[PDB]
């Protein structure tokens, strides 16, 4: 019979991450954009959706 | 780094020195001497 395909990516036991570094890598404990002055030594808001 | 927040950061090993140069040298020598059975390594911090 003709067929239409479906997909998923069932991925349990883990939490989605987004490092706060510029390269997205894991540079160190204290990120490279957790000490960049524009984000520390200053204020900011946040707005996700 | 971020100098205005460097002191406190260094005070609590936020981004300071490793646990081999702020530790009093006697204590590091001790821990290296008895790491085989009384490891104190995990009691301390190694900021990265």
């Amino acid at each position: 019979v003709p067929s239409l395909t479906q997909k998923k990516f069932l991925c349990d036991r883990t939490m989605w991450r987004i490092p706060f570094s510029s390269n997205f890598m894991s540079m160190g404990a204290l990120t490279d954009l957790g000490q960049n002055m524009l984000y520390a030594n200053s204020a900011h808001a946040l707005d996700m959706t | 780094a971020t100098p205005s927040m460097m002191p406190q950061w260094s005070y609590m090993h936020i981004a300071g020195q490793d646990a081999s140069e702020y530790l009093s040298p006697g204590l590091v020598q001790f821990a290296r001497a008895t790491d085989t059975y009384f490891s104190l390594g995990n009691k301390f911090r190694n900021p990265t």
Partner: peptide, 12 residues
Amino acid sequence: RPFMGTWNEIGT
């Protein structure tokens, strides 16, 4: 060459 991830004096 301070590109490393310094822990307390450069170098992993």
